[PDB]
Amino acid sequence: GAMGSMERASLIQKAKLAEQAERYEDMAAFMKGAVEKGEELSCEERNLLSVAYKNVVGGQRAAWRVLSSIEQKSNEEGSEEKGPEVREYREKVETELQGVCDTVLGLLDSHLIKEAGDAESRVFYLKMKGDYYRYLAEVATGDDKKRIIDSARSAYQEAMDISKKEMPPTNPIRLGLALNFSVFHYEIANSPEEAISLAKTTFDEAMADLHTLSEDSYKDSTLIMQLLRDNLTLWT
């Protein structure tokens, strides 16, 4: 790989620079190189990896939705035939999105998850696995769609099981996992009641544990609790 000749520490340094420059594709490429060195990632390094790919795929998802909406409108009654170009370009964006997802899933499978023994690392990686299968599910229309959805569910569920055993209810990773799994239920699994129940129970159990926290931990936890509340407000 093109980053094989660069020192691990230099890749991490450059990922941080790329983040400051809002160069998320470069950030992701640097972090992929760092992962491929084969050593486990620290907390900060796991966060860099996640931020980089979240921003790259986030932009691809936004573009895919714009193009999909145009394509859907083209297929309404009374819409003039404009040829294959909208489908082709939506497909191009879709294929690039799928590529990025497959790259992340590949890093997780070779070999981040299998080496992650602490709850904080293992839950984080399993949540990412769920997230990138969820993005694949958003664009899936074929024979494998159910298996893709189930892959996301399974990863999220394993993460949830560990998180509930090993982490306090205010832990930001536990909270972020629950946030995202709740969105999976609402948007992917056609399970809005499960989505709402998960968000509410997660919020409420977190609330009850805030008293244990420092000011700084309180700030971290309450930020994600507000995201849960924001989703609940959207859904109820």
Partner: peptide
């Protein structure tokens, strides 16, 4: 769209 992290 809903919030995710």
């Amino acid at each position: 769209f809903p919030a995710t992290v």
